[PDB]
Symmetry: none
């Protein structure tokens, strides 16, 4: 497999008193987006397929620094587990645009309609 | 007693510098909703009666992941202690709908009017 | 690790030589689905890995009031023992619907009916 | 001095990376409102005079549980140090009304105009 | 554990053989209601468990300016000693009303008058 | 170099699961704004030039205590690294006005247009 | 403990027998106001407690461009040594105004002119 | 310390005597830009400090489909070895654009073309 | 909570109608003694509370090489189901002796033979 | 803060008009010595500060089997109320001796007999 | 039951990476020695009978401050669980002698032979 | 593989400012002794072969509670890595004897000579 | 009072699960030795008189770095509270000799006999 | 993770077509052995996994003063590239001996010569 | 400078309530032994000259795992600051011998006499 | 950071034009030696870096009872101002000797007399 990008991304919507909102190490390929506990890639948390994934800018509206985008399955109501979208937060819009650009190489395109 | 459901739920409106917003282990029966410190059910925090309880979706409006619903007493201004409603937060709307469905089995129905 | 839900379910496809469809106490986590004789959890009949499990709606089933669904391993014939699929029943449809939302959370998705 | 009330109250607007938003033990008399680190009243943080103090409900608007009121000096732009108002947070509106009522006994009345 | 409130209250129903109605210093927590001779807390007259206590409005009472309310154990004759109910008085109605909100917080609810 | 001002300021938009929103010790001169880990000025985090910097009040709108202003480069889309503006938070508006005034001495003027 | 501000100020009322008005390096905290010969802080001329200090606008002063203000102990004749009040000057009015906001923060309020 | 990004890039200006332009695996942090023979990171060809580096658009370059950009030390002739500038290429423009946003984050800004 | 020991033991007194004496996988904690069909722990035959259990040496037993000991509830007839005592066997005496030391640790003491 | 000891002691010098010498439940800390009617601690007769207290052996006392010792304030006439010294008795000498070691720990030293 | 003594004591020989060497709240009566997590006596850790208990000074030899004594069963090799003796540590020899004296009242006498 | 024993054991001689002296979950078979981070056996720290292993009681001499034994290779100076022996600590001698007994079943015998 | 010395010293024999072995800020004068929580001397822990104090080297024998000396009262068995000696630990013998020398100036001389 | 040692070693068996035996900068951890051109670590020639590596004394070697040893994979022909074994040399025997102790620590044991 | 060795070593005799016994990153050359906070060598704690240094095995006698050696100045009573020797602890004797060997290359020889 | 010692010392070589030898209050840390007019620390005469300082015994000095020593910068003419060396005096030799041990601790070593 060819790696399109590896980097840190905060998972914004899968956090509470269980697993608090954390930052994971993501590895994007043309076929999957996996995340690990750290860049040593010793503990893998999940491997999501890029099939039917689109990208959308989340409700960044709340006056906070975090810049959010979200991946979703156009052929399903839930992207993974019982989540509608996988929200991914970054520190800047530049970083978000940067990642958006990498996703195009994986076949993950901006919201269809 | 027959248990309708046991699971974790975050108490959203009973938290501050005293007891911080925590997640408790809830046990729902046809007659009560009790919560414990953990699933070992060794330390019981409270036992609330299902009498006159209705269910309502809380001000989820704040751009956050938490999905909230709330239980209330239709024959009283306060559900327990000095709280108007008992706010219960979940990670997804699916989880909230899931719990809403269990409550119907306890006689706790969506907001009357 | 975290328990997703505990609740009673009827196993609809237990052999004649074991009473037939009986109600058992289920415990679901992100890794396994275990069932006990009761909520005291002194006797665990089985613990099935959440791995490769998918979920399907069982064509009505017996001539009863039960609403059925079933678990099946996407990669093999039997799901556990010599069973093909584990048939679960609920006296109500919304009960089946709340459990379907919980399985999603453990990663057990529908389809492949 | 006669004590009108002693209890815990969260100081909402005097917190950051210095002193984080904390809960202090307040002692209200007819002439002052002092706060300590704890109910042992060993470490006194401040003693504010009730002279020219009025009371007002703070921007509780943010979808959170905290219920806030605030004290201010009608003959000055700053109540203490460089703060416009002293924001005091509680867990319920009942608790806030409860404290509002105690303040009337100290000569601290609801916002004049 | 956490102290809900400390403040003076008049015990309206103390026997002739103890001065009659005297003012005592109360300390309320989620577990007990204790009263001292004064705010130095050197002499505690009593500590009553918050268990099974409910609250009722006392039919005006004596021919005075006092506003009365009383505590009574829902499950027994006497509330403490040989008392039936503990009569508490305040020179103002709002004073009684602020204390009623504090008792709710300890779980002492009204009715059963 | 002549120091115009030294003091603590919270960096509001450069924080996440990496470096959490922190408070640093800032040293402003007529030519630069540097920040250190602490007032001992042993660990320097950065040195920003005052060239082409303007000042603007950030989206303080979110009902919180923090009062924010932000510095930006009028001849560039990014002030430093990949940040549009450097958000600096204070406890009061007085503190913000206080710092605004110091910036004028450095040639950092309120938003041009 | 926390340093509120460090910056140069001119002491306007230093005796003829000490050069006259000289600029010194000030360090303000919530407890003291100290002044050094320079920003290296090798020689501290004095450390004045923030206790009982108040602030007044000095009637223009000398026939210069300096904007003056002064510190005085509300409870005594001299503020330090044999001084009555400590006269501080700034070449600009806004400079005096930023420092006035910092003193407020240490609790040094105006009036008593 | 924190890894900003890992991804393949083509070094466009490698000498004839080393295969010519080859693709290498880059790792960027706030301090260095390192390149390996591949993503297993067993052989690091070089580690270049982010210090004094700036970024320029390379005048199209060869007669190919590659989009080029280059790194150069603002304070010296060679960027590494005897190179002047390190030419990096991407088959797409948006690929170059995502990497430019990542370099900004490490402090490598454009211009000086 | 803490697991004291996991190891195989033969239950010597299982009824003819269940194969007879079979080896099961035991898990001992300070609260319970559970036995599974094997070390994968998919099927728990039983979980017996450590409460009131004592330990006795079983008068040799069958005409075999097994060394037997048994658990019995000091306060009742049956130890579990309709059993009186749970007979455990080991092919060696030291094996029985190591297990006796582990039970002591869970509080199961000898005597009452 | 830390409780040094809790145990019954007989107050030997209680006035005729209070039953005479009665046994009370004592609680000693490094700051106070409190006595209750019993170990439930519902009624505290008194709380005496450990300040300036010293300890003396009481000249045998009454014609009984009690071993007496007493507490007295080194700086005043009465130790509490109108008492001079608080006489404490134990049926055994070693009982008095264990309590003397506990008082030392709270700083109440012997002598001044 | 009559309480001989309540106080804090460190359990010296039941600690490791499981439960670290802790200090518990002990309650000694003529028939048992129980210990709790704290002086609120809400969580009881154990209740040991005083039957056949003797007392002995442990290997205090190690140059440390802790002063140790130990209780043991003369009619058994183990006092509780799999422990030979229950080691109890104190801060001073005085404290140890103090507790030794209390034990005599419980029938726990110094080592027999 | 047949498991002889699973349980917790403290590794006494492989700890310092790197990995502090920890407790691991050990699994002993007839051919190996492996240890994991916990009883979930998800993270395996090491797998040691039982070949040429003998057992010896370590320098328990230091007046501490820990009871130590150690495994060693008779055909080598080092048992694993650069360690002479693998020291394993327990809470009691009973626990140590208990484990010694299990080791005999693995072919690990008491020190040869 | 004239201060002979101020510095940090570890109290070696007054520590356990209550107050752990801590380091305090000591102030020695010709008449007392006081210690505070820190060098700000805001929280005073104790003030010991130098009357009848001698100095002795404690059981430094235990192979540790700490160098210990101890103060004692020659006219008493206990120096303060229920402690025989006040053990003070230092990092080097030089530091201990250094402090010994300062004590001579306070009238605290090496062990008499 | 933890670095075991960093130091120069001569690779004795580098091909003629690479200068021959050259000295390289080694970094050993419990997982890999990496070598750089120098101690600045800008160019890593290789990173070899500690897996399956063993160590042997190389039969003197060349007619020089070098003391040689070599690393070889117990489970394969080549250790890295087309090498069979990695020959390492030191000008002194004790130098080889210190490195052998470090490899043991990473688990590289001798023999299989 | 040529580096003889870099690695971690615990400083055993410079630790207390100030800087606790820590592990530092040491860099040994033919002329100095420096230590840093970590292997990034960003924060240097000290640089000691190898002049007149000898090596000696410290009082390892205390039954602990740590293996200690110590460096000292033969022409002085103190090696650095007020320390007689610089104690360096390791996990094994092998590690200590390993480091001893490296020191010989620096001119640091075993204790002279 | 940590204060090594605070104590009075006489500066023996202060010029005639400043009273001559006066006693000042010294504060020594591992970085600086500061002296104040007194122990209130309101006026710091100077703060000298511990850098390059060494210590020498001053050839008796004046015809007095003072024991002198002096600080001098090994790398320059003056130690502070136009002084060459800072002469410090003590009325006793042991006083000088205790201070010499403290300076060592800050790294100020003797010799170069």
């Amino acid at each position: 497999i060819l790696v399109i990008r590896k980097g840190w991304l905060t998972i914004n919507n899968i956090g509470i008193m269980k697993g608090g909102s954390k930052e994971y190490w993501f590895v994007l390929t043309a076929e999957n987006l996996s995340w690990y506990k750290d860049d040593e890639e010793k503990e893998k948390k999940y491997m999501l397929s890029v099939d039917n994934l689109k990208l959308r800018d989340v409700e960044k509206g709340f006056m906070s620094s975090k810049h959010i985008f979200a991946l979703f399955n156009t052929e399903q109501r839930n992207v993974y587990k019982d989540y509608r979208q996988l929200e991914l937060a970054c520190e800047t819009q530049e970083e978000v645009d940067s990642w958006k650009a990498s996703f195009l190489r994986a076949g993950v395109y901006p919201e269809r309609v």
